[PDB]
């Protein structure tokens, strides 16, 4: 980006900060665990039994 900006010839350049973006360890936060408002459901058919 920049590291110092005085006149149009007299500037300097530093590389941007390294930013790694990937998924979490063990895929934490992919799946709504312990969110009561939207829970998953394992049930048989005749499914009145979450």
């Amino acid at each position: 980006h920049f590291a110092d900006f005085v006149d149009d010839r007299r500037a300097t350049a530093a590389g941007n900060r390294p930013n790694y973006i990937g998924f979490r360890d063990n895929f934490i936060g992919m799946m709504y665990y312990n969110s009561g408002s939207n829970t998953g459901s394992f049930s048989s058919q005749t499914q009145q039994l979450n």
Binding site: S43, Q45, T46, Q47, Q48, L49, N50
Partner: protein
């Protein structure tokens, strides 16, 4: 009234829609399990759009 953990009000999303110029099919699987009773007076389509 039962004591066991049972959902009180159920949302169900369409299985297989169809969209064209004139109409908009939606197809639901209202899956009333055992030990459950529904009156269809409580049924309504909750339409969201623009």
């Amino acid at each position: 009234t039962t004591d066991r953990s049972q959902k009180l009000q159920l949302r169900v999303v369409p299985i297989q829609t169809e969209d064209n110029v004139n109409y908009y099919k939606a197809r639901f699987t209202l899956n009333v399990g055992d030990n459950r009773l529904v009156d269809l007076g409580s049924s309504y389509f909750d339409i969201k759009g623009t």
